[PDB]
């Protein structure tokens, strides 16, 4: 049994959005909505660039999904999945010059 973790649960658990990269051009928002719907009642999907933006009712539906979906074959295309982290609080420092 392979695994790996570090830090805190709330850290990643805080994320409630999955970043699916490397999508298919022949596929449609319908298929992508049905591919994930099988796991849990989706929230909303959008086709943006080679990747897509899908929302879930909660984090439990995103993790349990991305967990298995991670490394799947859709429409004969290698689809990738990565946890989409927030922008966080980015401040501005000095420049000196």
d(CA 83, CA 66): 8
Q: Give 70's contacts (C-beta < 8 A, 6+ positions apart).
A: 81
d(CA 52, CA 19): 7
Domain-by-domain residue ranges, the chain?
1-97
* Second CATH level (architecture) for the domain 1-97: 2-Layer Sandwich (3.30)
- Residue 15 near residue 86 (C-beta atoms within 8 A): yes
Q: Give 44's contacts (C-beta < 8 A, 6+ positions apart).
A: 54, 55
């Amino acid at each position: 049994g392979s695994s790996g973790s570090s830090g805190d649960p709330e850290v990643m658990a805080k994320v409630k959005v999955l970043f699916v990269r490397n999508l298919a051009t022949t596929v449609t928002e319908e298929i992508l909505e049905k591919s994930f719907s099988e796991f849990g009642k989706l929230e909303r999907v959008k086709k943006l660039k080679d990747y897509a933006f899908v929302h879930f009712e909660d984090r439990g539906a995103a993790v349990k999904a991305m967990d298995e979906m991670n490394g799947k074959e859709i429409e004969g295309e290698e689809i990738e999945i990565v946890l989409a982290k927030p922008p966080d609080k980015k401040r501005s420092g000095p420049s000196s010059g």
